[PDB]
């Protein structure tokens, strides 16, 4: 269900006269290791002439967040290949972990741009180590000291089809 980060490695099927071919590594986010290896092969095909038949997965491992509980801002490189040619994009997200930030980024992309997961690419992800490195205001508003906001429209659920109490919105 939830996205799972993974790392992939390969060496393009070593052959005669080329001992120990250089290793390559690429962090990947996918629901399963199979999709992660598929995206890794799709990236290697673009950045190199090699092909999945020409190589193999030297290793595959999940990358758990070092501090999942800790809140962290997360900028992310983004590019979507629609409707026109691909172009760079950037977005800030306040998420407790990089995987949840990638999930919220995929949701915001599918919403505000109708981009499909096949088109979206995550060139980079990195935490904002220090305050005021944030740029866009929508993250800055949450950084205010002693911030507090209400939820005036607390629409309580009612399992019963009927309600004699005439429920209020309180709050």
């Amino acid at each position: 269900a939830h996205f799972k980060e993974y790392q992939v490695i390969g060496r393009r099927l070593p052959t005669e006269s080329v001992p120990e071919p250089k290793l390559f590594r690429m962090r990947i986010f996918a629901s399963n290791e199979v999709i992660a290896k598929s995206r890794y092969w799709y990236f290697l095909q673009k950045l190199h002439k090699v092909k999945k038949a020409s190589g193999e997965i030297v290793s595959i491992n999940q990358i758990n967040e070092a501090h999942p509980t800790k809140v962290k801002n997360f900028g992310v490189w983004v590019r979507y290949d629609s409707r026109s040619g691909t172009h760079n994009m950037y977005k800030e997200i306040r998420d407790v972990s990089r995987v949840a930030a990638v999930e919220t980024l995929y949701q915001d992309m599918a919403a505000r741009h109708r981009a499909r997961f096949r088109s979206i690419h995550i060139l980079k992800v990195a935490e904002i180590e220090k305050t005021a490195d944030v740029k866009r205001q929508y993250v800055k508003q949450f950084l205010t000291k002693d911030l507090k906001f209400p939820l005036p429209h607390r629409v309580q659920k009612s399992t019963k089809t009927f309600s004699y109490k005439r429920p209020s919105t309180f709050y």
Binding site: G75, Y90, R136
Partner: peptide, 10 residues
């Protein structure tokens, strides 16, 4: 507006 543009250059 990327916070770490300088890091990618190196």
């Amino acid at each position: 507006n990327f916070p770490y543009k300088a890091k990618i250059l190196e």
